[PDB]
Amino acid sequence: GAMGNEYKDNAYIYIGNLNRELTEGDILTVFSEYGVPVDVILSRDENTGESQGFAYLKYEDQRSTILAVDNLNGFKIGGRALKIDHTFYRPKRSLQKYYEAVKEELDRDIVSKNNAEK
Amino acid sequence: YDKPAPENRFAIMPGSRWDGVHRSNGFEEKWFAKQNEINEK
């Protein structure tokens, strides 16, 4: 599970087979109980837009994503079965405050326990 | 004791944003309702 990298709050899920009229509010309400996300991303065609066909929302907890998945997986809504799946894409990169994250600033005080117990 | 069937472990409480609209995913949900609905013990 991405060993040596351990990504932070980067939990994202792919939502397909959704109603065209389905808006962000509807999506939030549906997933609201099943782990309401802090942000919703909707794909749009720059050529025309309007339609999406793809959408991704950020979950507060990566473990909570299991709920909506096993819950809305194959679930029928409006005559359409929802298709939930784990994503793999990363959000827009931002090199600013993350600068302070450079080097093991914390890391349990540079591994206080050191190498195993004395 | 062997459980009758698998279910959700993390019981995350609902939020206001949920609007309070009906949202179901499994009939087993009846089990959770029964636990919450206890007037005899």
Side-chain angles (χ1 to χ4, degrees):
Chain A
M3 301 295 180
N5 304 118
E6 299 182 338
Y7 290 93
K8 315 305 193 71
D9 56 339
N10 185 20
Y12 274 112
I13 43 170
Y14 165 54
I15 303 165
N17 198 354
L18 51 141
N19 234 39
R20 300 107 68 195
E21 69 83 19
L22 202 77
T23 182
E24 289 174 348
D26 289 346
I27 291 168
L28 285 158
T29 302
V30 172
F31 290 79
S32 157
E33 181 176 354
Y34 308 122
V36 69
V38 295
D39 195 27
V40 185
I41 301 169
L42 282 156
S43 296
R44 291 178 178 179
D45 181 354
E46 291 172 346
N47 187 49
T48 181
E50 303 294 339
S51 70
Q52 314 89 331
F54 321 97
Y56 321 82
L57 32 84
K58 193 196 289 301
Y59 251 49
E60 183 178 1
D61 290 342
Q62 47 270 29
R63 293 191 297 179
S64 292
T65 61
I66 292 168
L67 282 168
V69 173
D70 290 349
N71 290 337
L72 282 293
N73 165 274
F75 187 62
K76 292 181 180 182
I77 279 170
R80 303 280 183 79
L82 267 74
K83 168 159 273 286
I84 321 284
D85 199 35
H86 290 188
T87 61
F88 65 90
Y89 72 84
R90 294 181 294 169
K92 180 172 274 295
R93 59 179 65 182
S94 294
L95 208 181
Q96 183 175 359
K97 70 196 297 191
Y98 175 79
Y99 180 83
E100 73 86 29
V102 175
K103 198 177 181 180
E104 291 80 4
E105 290 295 313
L106 271 56
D107 192 357
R108 284 79 171 279
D109 195 359
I110 318 307
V111 195
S112 180
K113 291 168 69 172
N114 305 310
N115 185 332
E117 54 271 24
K118 297 190 288 188
Chain B
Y1 310 105
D2 183 351
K3 289 74 165 68
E7 59 182 354
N8 38 294
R9 235 292 199 187
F10 4 62
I12 299 170
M13 63 212 68
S16 294
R17 198 96 290 165
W18 180 30
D19 192 290
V21 294
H22 305 121
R23 282 289 93 80
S24 299
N25 51 309
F27 202 68
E28 64 188 5
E29 183 174 54
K30 63 182 180 180
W31 184 88
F32 288 83
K34 288 275 182 178
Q35 292 294 120
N36 289 340
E37 286 172 348
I38 296 171
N39 302 125
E40 184 178 34
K41 200 194 295 309

Short mmCIF file of all heavy atoms in Angstrom, two decimals, chain B residues 2 4 7-10 12-13 20-21 23-24 26-29 31-32 34 36 39-41:
data_model
loop_
_atom_site.label_atom_id
_atom_site.label_comp_id
_atom_site.label_asym_id
_atom_site.label_seq_id
_atom_site.Cartn_x
_atom_site.Cartn_y
_atom_site.Cartn_z
N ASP B 2 -20.55 -16.93 16.44
CA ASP B 2 -20.49 -16.66 15.01
C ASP B 2 -21.57 -15.65 14.61
O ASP B 2 -22.75 -15.86 14.88
CB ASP B 2 -20.69 -17.95 14.22
CG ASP B 2 -20.56 -17.68 12.72
OD1 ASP B 2 -20.50 -16.52 12.36
OD2 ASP B 2 -20.53 -18.63 11.97
N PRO B 4 -24.22 -13.57 12.35
CA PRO B 4 -25.18 -14.00 11.29
C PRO B 4 -24.78 -13.49 9.90
O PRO B 4 -24.95 -14.19 8.90
CB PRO B 4 -26.52 -13.37 11.74
CG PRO B 4 -26.14 -12.21 12.60
CD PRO B 4 -24.83 -12.60 13.28
N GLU B 7 -21.32 -6.61 8.50
CA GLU B 7 -21.95 -5.29 8.48
C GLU B 7 -20.90 -4.20 8.66
O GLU B 7 -19.71 -4.49 8.79
CB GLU B 7 -22.99 -5.19 9.59
CG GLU B 7 -22.32 -5.43 10.95
CD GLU B 7 -23.37 -5.37 12.06
OE1 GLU B 7 -24.50 -5.05 11.77
OE2 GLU B 7 -23.01 -5.65 13.20
N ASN B 8 -21.35 -2.95 8.66
CA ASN B 8 -20.44 -1.83 8.82
C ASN B 8 -19.94 -1.74 10.26
O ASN B 8 -20.72 -1.84 11.20
CB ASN B 8 -21.15 -0.53 8.44
CG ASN B 8 -22.60 -0.57 8.93
OD1 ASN B 8 -23.40 -1.37 8.45
ND2 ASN B 8 -22.98 0.26 9.87
N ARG B 9 -18.62 -1.56 10.42
CA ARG B 9 -18.03 -1.46 11.75
C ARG B 9 -18.02 0.00 12.22
O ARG B 9 -18.48 0.31 13.32
CB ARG B 9 -16.58 -2.03 11.73
CG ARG B 9 -16.41 -3.13 12.80
CD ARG B 9 -16.49 -2.51 14.21
NE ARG B 9 -15.92 -3.41 15.20
CZ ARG B 9 -16.00 -3.14 16.50
NH1 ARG B 9 -16.60 -2.06 16.90
NH2 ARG B 9 -15.49 -3.97 17.37
N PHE B 10 -17.47 0.88 11.39
CA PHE B 10 -17.39 2.30 11.72
C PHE B 10 -18.77 2.95 11.61
O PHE B 10 -19.27 3.18 10.51
CB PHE B 10 -16.38 3.03 10.76
CG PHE B 10 -15.85 2.06 9.72
CD1 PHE B 10 -16.73 1.46 8.80
CD2 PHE B 10 -14.48 1.75 9.67
CE1 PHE B 10 -16.25 0.57 7.84
CE2 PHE B 10 -14.00 0.85 8.71
CZ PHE B 10 -14.88 0.26 7.80
N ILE B 12 -20.17 5.93 11.66
CA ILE B 12 -20.01 7.38 11.56
C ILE B 12 -21.38 8.07 11.62
O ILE B 12 -22.28 7.75 10.85
CB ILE B 12 -19.32 7.74 10.24
CG1 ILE B 12 -17.94 7.08 10.19
CG2 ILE B 12 -19.17 9.26 10.13
CD1 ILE B 12 -17.34 7.23 8.79
N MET B 13 -21.52 9.00 12.56
CA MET B 13 -22.78 9.71 12.72
C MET B 13 -23.08 10.61 11.51
O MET B 13 -22.17 11.14 10.89
CB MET B 13 -22.72 10.57 13.99
CG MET B 13 -21.61 11.63 13.84
SD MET B 13 -20.89 11.96 15.46
CE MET B 13 -20.07 10.35 15.69
N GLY B 20 -31.15 14.94 5.56
CA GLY B 20 -32.05 14.03 6.26
C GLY B 20 -32.87 13.20 5.28
O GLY B 20 -33.89 12.62 5.65
N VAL B 21 -32.42 13.16 4.02
CA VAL B 21 -33.11 12.40 2.99
C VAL B 21 -32.88 10.90 3.18
O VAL B 21 -31.87 10.49 3.74
CB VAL B 21 -32.64 12.82 1.60
CG1 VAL B 21 -33.06 14.26 1.33
CG2 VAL B 21 -31.11 12.71 1.53
N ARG B 23 -31.64 7.38 2.60
CA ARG B 23 -30.51 6.78 1.87
C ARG B 23 -30.24 5.38 2.40
O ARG B 23 -29.77 5.21 3.53
CB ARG B 23 -29.26 7.66 2.02
CG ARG B 23 -29.35 8.88 1.08
CD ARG B 23 -29.19 8.44 -0.40
NE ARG B 23 -30.49 8.18 -1.01
CZ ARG B 23 -31.26 9.17 -1.45
NH1 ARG B 23 -30.84 10.41 -1.35
NH2 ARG B 23 -32.42 8.91 -1.98
N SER B 24 -30.54 4.37 1.58
CA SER B 24 -30.34 2.97 1.98
C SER B 24 -29.31 2.30 1.08
O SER B 24 -29.09 2.72 -0.05
CB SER B 24 -31.65 2.20 1.89
OG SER B 24 -32.61 2.79 2.77
N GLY B 26 -28.44 -1.36 2.16
CA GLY B 26 -28.63 -2.77 2.47
C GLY B 26 -29.82 -2.97 3.40
O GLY B 26 -30.09 -2.14 4.27
N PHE B 27 -30.53 -4.08 3.22
CA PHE B 27 -31.69 -4.39 4.05
C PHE B 27 -31.24 -4.70 5.48
O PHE B 27 -32.01 -4.55 6.43
CB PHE B 27 -32.47 -5.57 3.46
CG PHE B 27 -33.89 -5.56 3.97
CD1 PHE B 27 -34.76 -4.53 3.58
CD2 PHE B 27 -34.35 -6.56 4.84
CE1 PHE B 27 -36.08 -4.50 4.04
CE2 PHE B 27 -35.67 -6.53 5.31
CZ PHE B 27 -36.53 -5.51 4.91
N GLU B 28 -30.00 -5.15 5.62
CA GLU B 28 -29.46 -5.49 6.93
C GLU B 28 -29.55 -4.30 7.88
O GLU B 28 -29.51 -4.46 9.10
CB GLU B 28 -28.00 -5.93 6.79
CG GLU B 28 -27.15 -4.76 6.28
CD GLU B 28 -25.74 -5.25 5.96
OE1 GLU B 28 -25.51 -6.44 6.04
OE2 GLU B 28 -24.92 -4.41 5.62
N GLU B 29 -29.67 -3.10 7.31
CA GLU B 29 -29.76 -1.88 8.11
C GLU B 29 -30.81 -2.05 9.21
O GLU B 29 -30.75 -1.38 10.25
CB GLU B 29 -30.13 -0.69 7.23
CG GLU B 29 -30.15 0.58 8.07
CD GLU B 29 -30.37 1.80 7.17
OE1 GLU B 29 -31.35 1.80 6.44
OE2 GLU B 29 -29.56 2.71 7.23
N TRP B 31 -31.05 -4.25 11.25
CA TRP B 31 -30.38 -4.69 12.47
C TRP B 31 -30.00 -3.49 13.34
O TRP B 31 -30.24 -3.49 14.55
CB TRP B 31 -29.12 -5.47 12.11
CG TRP B 31 -28.50 -6.00 13.35
CD1 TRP B 31 -28.80 -7.19 13.93
CD2 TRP B 31 -27.47 -5.40 14.19
NE1 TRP B 31 -28.03 -7.35 15.06
CE2 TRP B 31 -27.19 -6.27 15.27
CE3 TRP B 31 -26.76 -4.18 14.12
CZ2 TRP B 31 -26.24 -5.95 16.24
CZ3 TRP B 31 -25.81 -3.86 15.09
CH2 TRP B 31 -25.55 -4.74 16.15
N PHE B 32 -29.41 -2.48 12.72
CA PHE B 32 -29.01 -1.29 13.45
C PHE B 32 -30.22 -0.60 14.07
O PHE B 32 -30.16 -0.12 15.20
CB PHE B 32 -28.30 -0.32 12.51
CG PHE B 32 -26.94 -0.87 12.14
CD1 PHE B 32 -26.82 -1.80 11.11
CD2 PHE B 32 -25.80 -0.45 12.84
CE1 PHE B 32 -25.56 -2.31 10.77
CE2 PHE B 32 -24.54 -0.96 12.50
CZ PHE B 32 -24.42 -1.89 11.46
N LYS B 34 -32.99 -1.99 15.02
CA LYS B 34 -33.47 -2.79 16.15
C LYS B 34 -32.66 -2.48 17.41
O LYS B 34 -33.22 -2.38 18.50
CB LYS B 34 -33.34 -4.29 15.81
CG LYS B 34 -34.40 -4.68 14.76
CD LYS B 34 -35.73 -5.03 15.45
CE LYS B 34 -36.75 -5.48 14.40
NZ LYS B 34 -38.02 -5.84 15.09
N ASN B 36 -31.10 0.31 18.10
CA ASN B 36 -31.46 1.65 18.54
C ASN B 36 -32.86 1.66 19.13
O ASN B 36 -33.17 2.46 20.01
CB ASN B 36 -31.39 2.63 17.36
CG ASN B 36 -29.93 2.86 16.96
OD1 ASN B 36 -29.02 2.62 17.76
ND2 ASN B 36 -29.66 3.33 15.78
N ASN B 39 -36.92 -0.77 24.04
CA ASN B 39 -37.72 -0.21 25.14
C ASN B 39 -37.92 -1.25 26.25
O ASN B 39 -38.64 -1.01 27.21
CB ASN B 39 -39.09 0.24 24.62
CG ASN B 39 -38.90 1.27 23.51
OD1 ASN B 39 -39.42 1.10 22.41
ND2 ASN B 39 -38.19 2.34 23.75
N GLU B 40 -37.26 -2.40 26.11
CA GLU B 40 -37.37 -3.47 27.10
C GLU B 40 -36.00 -4.09 27.37
O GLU B 40 -35.30 -4.48 26.44
CB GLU B 40 -38.34 -4.55 26.61
CG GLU B 40 -38.52 -5.61 27.70
CD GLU B 40 -39.52 -6.67 27.23
OE1 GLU B 40 -39.54 -6.95 26.04
OE2 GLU B 40 -40.24 -7.19 28.07
N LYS B 41 -35.64 -4.18 28.64
CA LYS B 41 -34.36 -4.76 29.02
C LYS B 41 -34.27 -4.92 30.54
O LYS B 41 -35.21 -5.43 31.12
CB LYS B 41 -33.21 -3.87 28.53
CG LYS B 41 -31.91 -4.68 28.46
CD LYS B 41 -30.70 -3.73 28.32
CE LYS B 41 -30.77 -2.99 26.98
NZ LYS B 41 -30.95 -3.98 25.88
#
